[PDB]
Write a protein that binds this ligand. Structure first.
Ligand code: XYP
Length: 404
């Protein structure tokens, strides 16, 4: 049965990981997780997201392909880092190494870039040119990519050691220093190096920062990352307070100020959507809250955040002519951007690790578990989240500490 009373003590401290799918009475759980990875990482052109990159017939590395029917396929740091994360959780070293080799070679901006703000950060959008060779479309970062890269690299060090192709640990510490030096304002993750007083709630994964703190080897840095963790929980708590009730109706938003206030409308040239939309990034917020509750312990704010967000989505579904909740809301109003897809349902299933409502759990969990693995033209974002959620709901998303 669903555990509707999640522990205040996290799995990171106790070593006890929940298996949500098992709580929900499912069977063949590990087989389903394993086939999800195999199909995402297999050469089937169906669920597949993991593709080789070759130059003049010489194999180089692999990438997570951000398939995109509207704008042309591209390659993103988020997807790359998520794929590495999935690989390390399932002990898939070759896949991990192939993805990391690509990131370090082709996504990383040089340390001597003329713009100091870009030095060592990872260009968020690459493409293959008309001759098949990789190039950077946009050198600016998507900072949760660097967050996941650091996380994944620290875990790779812990599981596999540092005497193979990569010194994962050194690569991870380099990544953490890049985050600190290039991607932080006042210990809050930036949306952009070029804009102050701006964060993206979906980038806040407080438990990652606690894991970073336990995996650095100097006291100042340990304290730094613990403080980032506390400030991240504060930001999320504040954001959830600010989106409660009217006018945001309990869904977190794309962009926020450092006090948690949603950003209203457009604020910069190039911005893809209004700041106050619950959109694709925002989907991940309650997933991250579930993650944090599971790994570091459920507090009242985690439970309220998820219970109210899921409650809104259920209500919104009852007020939808398609009998679905949608992908994009603004001020509690549907924006007609489609019924929830697999990735949104996956994010919401992970959020259940902070839920106290068994009825909600039954519904959101079963809506995820009944899905087939994403295929087709929208599978990048749906399929990447589906993979992560499969790990989270099967007890496979674990923190592996390094030993000093
Ligand atoms: O995310 C959606 C996806 O699940 C679907 O398959 O295609 C339409 C998208 O908007």
């Amino acid at each position: 049965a669903f555990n509707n009373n999640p522990s205040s003590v996290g799995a990171y401290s106790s070593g006890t990981y929940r298996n949500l799918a098992q709580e929900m009475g499912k069977t063949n759980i590990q087989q389903k997780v394993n086939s999800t990875f195999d199909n995402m990482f297999g050469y089937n052109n169906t669920q597949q997201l993991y593709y080789p990159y070759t130059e003049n017939g010489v194999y180089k590395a692999h990438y997570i392909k951000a398939i995109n029917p509207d704008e042309g396929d591209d390659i993103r740091t988020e997807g790359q880092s998520w794929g590495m994360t999935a690989a390390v959780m399932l002990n898939k070293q070759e896949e991990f190494d192939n993805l990391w080799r690509f990131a370090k070679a082709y996504q990383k901006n040089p340390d001597n870039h003329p713009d100091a703000k870009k030095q060592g950060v990872y260009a968020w959008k690459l493409k293959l040119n008309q001759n098949g060779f990789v190039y950077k479309v946009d050198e600016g970062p998507a900072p949760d990519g660097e967050e996941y890269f650091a996380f994944a690299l620290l875990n790779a060090s812990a599981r596999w050691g540092n005497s193979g192709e990569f010194n994962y640990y050194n690569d991870a510490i380099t990544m953490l220093n890049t985050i600190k030096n290039k991607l932080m304002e006042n210990q809050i993750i930036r949306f952009s190096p070029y804009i102050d007083n701006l964060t993206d709630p979906s980038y806040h994964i407080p438990a990652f920062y606690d894991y970073f703190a336990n995996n650095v080897t100097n006291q100042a840095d340990k304290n730094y990352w613990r403080q980032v963790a506390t400030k991240s929980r504060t930001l999320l708590k504040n954001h959830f307070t600010k989106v409660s009730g009217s006018p945001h109706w309990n869904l977190p938003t794309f962009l926020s100020r450092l006090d948690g206030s949603p950003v209203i409308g457009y604020i910069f040239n190039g911005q893809a959507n209004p700041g106050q939309w619950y959109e694709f990034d925002a989907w991940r917020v309650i997933m991250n809250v579930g993650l944090d509750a599971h790994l570091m312990g459920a507090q009242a704010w985690h439970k309220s955040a998820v219970n109210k967000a899921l409650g809104f989505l259920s209500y919104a579904k009852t007020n939808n002519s398609k009998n679905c909740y949608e992908q994009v809301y603004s001020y509690g109003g549907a924006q007609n951007r489609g019924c929830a897809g697999e990735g949104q349902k996956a994010a919401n299933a992970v959020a259940l690790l902070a839920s106290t409502n068994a009825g909600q759990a039954n519904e959101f969990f079963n809506e995820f578990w009944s899905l087939s693995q994403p295929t087709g033209d929208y599978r990048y974002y749906n399929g990447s989240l589906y993979m992560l959620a499969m790990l989270h709901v099967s007890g496979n998303f674990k923190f592996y500490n390094n030993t000093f």
